């Protein structure tokens, strides 16, 4: 119910389209009122909660109600897009360190859950490409955490057309 949470939810909704540049900018502007640690943590919690809501097998698939069935992969991918966007766009020092500390605290999400991610079913038959997309985004985030110099340069490149 907090404003930053509504913004993150908009950016990471189950809709087929988005996030737009404006959605991401809106999430980012919460840094003037909310710590980056919390923005990062809520993004991870949404990611985890939407991974957990999926059925394990056909028995539970048929018996749990499961709104968003076959489109949960989108929330997962968009949450990773938000994390990548924050890493590239927040200020050096306090803001960036807060994101990184939150990700490191929960590093298993990247090193296990995302690394091993499977999309069993998606509504358009394209499970393979969605799975690949998610693992790739997870890989990029891990690279940013593993190689500070790469992250530093990408952040500098990201400013080239800032205005």
From Swiss-Prot:
The keyword Cytoplasm applies. This is Epsin-5. The chain holds residues 31 to 192 of 411 of the full protein. GO terms for biological process: actin filament organization; early endosome to Golgi transport; endocytosis; Golgi to endosome transport; late endosome to vacuole transport via multivesicular body sorting pathway; protein transport. It comes from the Eukaryota. Involved in the recruitment of clathrin to the Golgi network and endosomes to form clathrin coated vesicles. Plays a role in the trafficking of clathrin between the Golgi network and endosomes. Binds to membranes enriched in phosphatidylinositol-3,5-bisphosphate (PtdIns(3,5)P2) and, in association with VPS27, is involved in protein sorting at the multivesicular body (MVB). Present with 8100 molecules/cell in log phase SD medium. Keywords: Acetylation, Cytoplasm, Endosome, Lipid-binding, Membrane, Phosphoprotein, Protein transport, Transport. Signal peptide: none annotated. Residues 2-155 form the ENTH domain. One of its GO terms (cellular component) is cytosol. It is found in: Cytoplasm; Endosome membrane. It comes from Saccharomyces cerevisiae (strain ATCC 204508 / S288c). Interacts with the clathrin adapter GGA2 and the clathrin adapter complex AP-1. GO terms for molecular function: clathrin binding; phosphatidylinositol-3,5-bisphosphate binding; phospholipid binding.
């Amino acid at each position: 119910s907090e404003p930053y949470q509504i913004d993150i939810r908009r950016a990471t909704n189950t809709d087929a389209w988005g996030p737009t540049p404006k959605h991401l900018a809106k999430v980012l502007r919460n840094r003037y009122q909310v710590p980056l640690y919390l923005m990062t943590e809520y993004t991870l919690k949404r990611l985890v909660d939407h991974i957990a809501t999926r059925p394990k097998n056909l028995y539970e698939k048929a018996r749990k109600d499961y709104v968003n069935y076959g489109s949960e992969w989108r929330v997962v991918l968009k949450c990773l897009v938000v994390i990548e966007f924050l890493l590239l766009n927040v200020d050096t020092g306090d803001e960036l360190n807060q994101i990184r500390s939150c990700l490191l605290t929960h590093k298993h999400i990247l090193t296990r859950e995302i690394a091993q991610f499977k999309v069993k079913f998606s509504n358009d038959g394209k499970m393979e490409i969605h799975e690949r997309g998610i693992r790739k985004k997870g890989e990029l985030i891990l690279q940013y955490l593993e190689d500070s110099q790469f992250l530093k340069k990408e952040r500098a490149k990201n400013k080239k057309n800032a205005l």
